[PDB]
Amino acid sequence: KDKLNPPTPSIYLENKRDAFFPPLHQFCTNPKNPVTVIRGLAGALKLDLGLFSTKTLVEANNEHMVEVRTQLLQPADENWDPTGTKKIWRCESNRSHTTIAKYAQYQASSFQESLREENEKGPFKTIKFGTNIDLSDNKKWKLQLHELTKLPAFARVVSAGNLLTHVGHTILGMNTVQLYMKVPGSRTPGHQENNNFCSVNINIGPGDCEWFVVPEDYWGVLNDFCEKNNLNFLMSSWWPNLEDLYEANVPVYRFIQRPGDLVWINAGTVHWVQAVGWCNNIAWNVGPLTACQYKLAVERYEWNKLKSVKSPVPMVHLSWNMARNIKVSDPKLFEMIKYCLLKILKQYQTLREALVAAGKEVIWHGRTNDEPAHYCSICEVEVFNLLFVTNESNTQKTYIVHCHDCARKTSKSLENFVVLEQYKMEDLIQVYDQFTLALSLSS
Numbered sequence: 001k002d003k004l005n006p007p008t009p010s011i012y013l014e015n016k017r018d019a020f021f022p023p024l025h026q027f028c029t030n031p032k033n034p035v036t037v038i039r040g041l042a043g044a045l046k047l048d049l050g051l052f053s054t055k056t057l058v059e060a061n062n063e064h065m066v067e068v069r070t071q072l073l074q075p076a077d078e079n080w081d082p083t084g085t086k087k088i089w090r091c092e093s094n095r096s097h098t099t100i101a102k103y104a105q106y107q108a109s110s111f112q113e114s115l116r117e118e119n120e121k122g123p124f125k126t127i128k129f130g131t132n133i134d135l136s137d138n139k140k141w142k143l144q145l146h147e148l149t150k151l152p153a154f155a156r157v158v159s160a161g162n163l164l165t166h167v168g169h170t171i172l173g174m175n176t177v178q179l180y181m182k183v184p185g186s187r188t189p190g191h192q193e194n195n196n197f198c199s200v201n202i203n204i205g206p207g208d209c210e211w212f213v214v215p216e217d218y219w220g221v222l223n224d225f226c227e228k229n230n231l232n233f234l235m236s237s238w239w240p241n242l243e244d245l246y247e248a249n250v251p252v253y254r255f256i257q258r259p260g261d262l263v264w265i266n267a268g269t270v271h272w273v274q275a276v277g278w279c280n281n282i283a284w285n286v287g288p289l290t291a292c293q294y295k296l297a298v299e300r301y302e303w304n305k306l307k308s309v310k311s312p313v314p315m316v317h318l319s320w321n322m323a324r325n326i327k328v329s330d331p332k333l334f335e336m337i338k339y340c341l342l343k344i345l346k347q348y349q350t351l352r353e354a355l356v357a358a359g360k361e362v363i364w365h366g367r368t369n370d371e372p373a374h375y376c377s378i379c380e381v382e383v384f385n386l387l388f389v390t391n392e393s394n395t396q397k398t399y400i401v402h403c404h405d406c407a408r409k410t411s412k413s414l415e416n417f418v419v420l421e422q423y424k425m426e427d428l429i430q431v432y433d434q435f436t437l438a439l440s441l442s443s
């Protein structure tokens, strides 16, 4: 169909007025738009993209760590097996480390070498992609992070309307910025964002990137291709065959992101990306306060448990922080959060009563304010409020956390464990009771 290659939802910005215009964030967060490309964003805001140029990064922090992914230079939009006889989904990539200075040399010499070649089915060249460069330290990247505060509020790393701001602690690469340094053919394999949170990506240039996007409600189709072809959807590297997708009637959005264009990946959108030239990119996540974002984040949280995959966003901890500190005026969002909190509260009361009925002591432990969420040291599930810690770890004050299930499996009557309580039931009951719909006259 004509419907399988739809146009890209695109906003064309000329000036600051266009950037701060409220219908912009409404357009981005609209679930009908799986991706929005905000063209001319850097130029409209007079953002200095030079602060993220390779030359400036080397000057700034030359020994800064870079995760290198070594990949094959594949033709156009295809992915061929090593031999060059068939198109396959699987893509191979080894990981190593280098520094900004060393990767910069490679990026620069790669460009010089292509100029020289320009003046002179397999097999494929090997290229290196500089990935996951951690721009979290404000003392190392002061000017860079300050430049990003010039964005409109809805797209910033930190803002009142961002769920990831309400988490109350750092989640690396989600509420901190990551940088990517690229050469032609540097590929980002197919994926969804952590816990289906929206992402913001700005191309620093000077080259272009080519994006491929499938709406969230088709992710189950791609999951099936992965299972059929012996791939883990969440954990393997794969590059979809567009003819497979065409055949299965999956619509594919496809577009070029030029320097200074911002790409908004909406909640749960499946996407993959390749550099067309030499460029850098910066990216982070944002969680808009919408029913759709919250719903998709909870669904993925629950799906991750089934797949034994850690959720980077602690949705229980987050949901309590929303109830404590956010006046929520959307009826559909409010009812989702309320329902979730009730589930948490009931499950916690059931467990706590079973412990007390078995004669197991619950130790008041409290909590430092701003203390991060805890995860089970064995299975990596989020553990809320009741923490299971071995007698020895308790004595040593290391407080290594287990979930109830993992503690039970280790020690059948919990004889090896103490149960630590970080919040009184009465306090949580009140936060729940005092969490009510705020009236708003807007839509």
Ligand SMILES: OCCCNc1cc(N2CCc3ccccc3CC2)nc(-c2ccccn2)n1
Pocket: 069, 093, 129, 131, 132, 180, 187, 188, 189, 191, 192, 193, 194, 201, 237, 273, 281, 282, 283
């Ligand atoms: O525009 C730049 C950013 C493109 N987006 C990327 C790149 C990337 N890199 C690491 C993954 C990887 C593995 C193997 C080969 C290549 C890559 C891509 C880099 N990882 C992610 C990511 C990871 C976890 C959750 C959400 N997103 N997003």
Ligand SMILES: [Fe+2]
Pocket: 191, 192, 193, 199
């Ligand atoms: Fe990503």
Ligand SMILES: [Zn+2]
Pocket: 376, 377, 378, 379, 380, 381, 402, 403, 404, 405, 406, 407
């Ligand atoms: Zn566990």
